[PDB]
Design a binder for this molecule. Sequence first.
Ligand code: IQO
Length: 367
Amino acid sequence: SDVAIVKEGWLHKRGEYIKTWRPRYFLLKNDGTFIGYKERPQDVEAPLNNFSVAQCQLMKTERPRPNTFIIRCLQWTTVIERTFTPEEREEWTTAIQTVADGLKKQVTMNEFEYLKLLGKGTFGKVILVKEKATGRYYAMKILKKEVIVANRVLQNSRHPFLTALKYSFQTHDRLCFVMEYANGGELFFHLSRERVFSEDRARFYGAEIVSALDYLHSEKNVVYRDLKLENLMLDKDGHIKITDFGLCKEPEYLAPEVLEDNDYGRAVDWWGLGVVMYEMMCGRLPFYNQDHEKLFELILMEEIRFPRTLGPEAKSLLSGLLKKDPKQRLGGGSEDAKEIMQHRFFAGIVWQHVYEKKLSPPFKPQV
Ligand SMILES: O=c1[nH]c2ccccc2n1C1CCN(Cc2ccc(-c3nc4cc5[nH]cnc5cc4nc3-c3ccccc3)cc2)CC1
């Protein structure tokens, strides 16, 4: 199957973490691809599902400026949205919706029992529910369907280190997603009590993250982009479970190309591997400051310092993961997760073993 450009041109994309207005050249193809570039590209390669406008609908508004439209897609279980003379704004938003709809062409609210509120966001709330039929618990992501809409594909998407989506059902006004719940708390906790983690213990959590990210990259062709210490829970045995609770805005964990609103890919995930792993092995964020203009400046501009404790392999790995330039960042190459798996700091490891959970958990949750 081949595809052509439905429409293209310059667009003003609005920064999410730096809310300047930015010029980007976009092109929509009839695979669903909607991608913006730093400048008018040449050959015009398998893009990520992130840049696909499937299951979307648009919008128009004159704030902060008069010519503006908005897209809101339901990616997996999350709702994402992006903010971009007035005549075009009714042809662009014509084509995008066309392809979106063209691309679309191809358990009830209570077996569950409310337990507590896990969190709330612009687009909804996350709930703990006991299954009244089973007893074992779940998290339930409840999105308001009128922000967007105003398949058991979820058995393929099983990975030992990702929280599983077990049920998704709709009702009168809400979109519900029932994902599994890990018992053993999240790292942010256990790292506070421990202050820092050995390289061995950091190699355990990093390895399981890499397995999960490899899986999302190769199999699902999506970047996760939200890798942060607080998004890592443990199951009852102490193994990783990466959470999926995005309700709107989740910065210290985002890569330069993301805060700048440039082209990004699988590399933003490895950057975050860098930050999460640096944070484990050092006790501190690599880039922090109470002031946000300083925070962004550190991440984009400044070098990273290593405590003297750190072995040569551990810092070769962190330096590479935390390169500012994506095409130079360890993992940003064509082989992706493999060049991480093959770095010397992970020497000896056979990765089918990590998948199978043959690795010894440094920390057993009391559950
Ligand atoms: O980019 C953005 N612009 C935004 C603008 C506003 C708000 C939020 C935005 N975001 C986020 C959107 C969500 N971003 C996190 C995430 C990534 C992948 C899966 C994800 N996608 C899948 C697809 C599949 N298609 C077929 N099978 C699939 C399985 C998937 N499994 C899993 C997943 C599940 C559990 C843990 C981790 C990933 C989930 C969450 C973080 C950024």
